[PDB]
Amino acid sequence: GKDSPLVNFLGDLDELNSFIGFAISKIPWEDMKKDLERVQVELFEIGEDLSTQSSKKKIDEKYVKWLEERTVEYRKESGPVKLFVIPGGSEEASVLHVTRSVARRVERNAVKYTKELPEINRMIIVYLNRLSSLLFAMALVANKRRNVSEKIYDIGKFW
Template identity: 35%
Template sequence: MVTLNRIYTRAGDAGTTRLASGAQVSKSDARVETYGAVDETNACLGLARVHTRNAGAFDALLARLQNELFDLGADLATPAATDEAAGTKLRILDSQVARLEGEIDALNAELPALKSFVLPGGTEAAAALHLARTVCRRAEREAVRLTEAGESVSGPAMRYLNRLSDLLFVAARYANDKGAAEVFWVSGGTR
C-alpha cells in the first residue's frame, strides 16, 4: 500500500522527475509522456464514471479499468531490466488483454452493426468515453514512439493500450443507449 503524507516535495521544481527505477529524467521524457497520457486516460474514465455510477456492472467494468491503468502506468514507469526475473515487477499480462477482448465481444454483441462512422457524442457518458478513447490512442502512439526510440515497452502493455481504445469505443456506443442515441457522420453532409 502506498502512503502519501506530503503531496509536494519540490524535487521536480527543476523540470525533472524520477522513474520507478530511481532514474532521474526530464518531465518531457518520452516515457513520462507515455505514462502521463495513460494517467489522462484514467482521468477521462473518472469523468465518464460520474455518468455511469448507477450502471451496475458497466460502471464496475470502468472502475476495474481505472485500477488497471494505474498498473499500466507502473509498468511504463519501470523500464525493464535485462536481468529482471518474471513476476518481480508490476507488469500488464496477456491475460488482461484477453479479458479486454472478451469484454469487447460481450458489449458489442448487444449493439447494432455500424453502417457509418460514429461521431463522438450522444449521452454524457458516451462523450466522456470517446474522450477517454482518443486520449488512450495518444498513449498508444506515445508508447510506439518510445519503442521506436529504442526504449522498452512490454508487448502486453502495447496490446493492452490497443485493446483498451477498442473497448472504450464499444463502451461509448453501449453508453449511447446501446446504440440508439449514437450520432453518425454524414459524409459530405455540409456541402
C-alpha cells in the same frame, strides 16, 4: 530529469486514467463502472511495468483477453453499427468517446516512446489498442440505453 520518454508516458497514462475517472462519474450503469474501475487499476499496473522494466508487474495476454471479452459482450447488446460512428449522442456516450480519443492519443505516443525506450513491454501497446475498442463498444451501448441513435459518416462497412 523530466520531459523524458518515461515521465511523459506515465503522464499520458495519468491523463487517460483521469478521463476514465470522469467517464465513471458520469455513467450510471454498474456494469460499465465496474469494467472501467478495473481498467484504472490496470493503468497503474502498466505504469509499474514501465517504471520497473516489467519487474514489479508484467502486462500479459490475459489483461488483453479480458478487454476483448468485455468488448464482445457490449457489442452483443448494441448489435451491429455502421461505420464510421460520429462521436457523440448521450452525454454518457460522448464522454466515453472523448476518453476513447485520449486512449488513442496515448497509444500513438506509446509507439513513439518505444523508439526511445525499446525495453517497453509490447503488450502495453496492445492493451491500449484494445482499450479504445472497448470504450467505443461501451459508447454504443450507452446511446442505446439512452434511446439515442448513432450519427454515421458512412464508409460502407459495419461492425
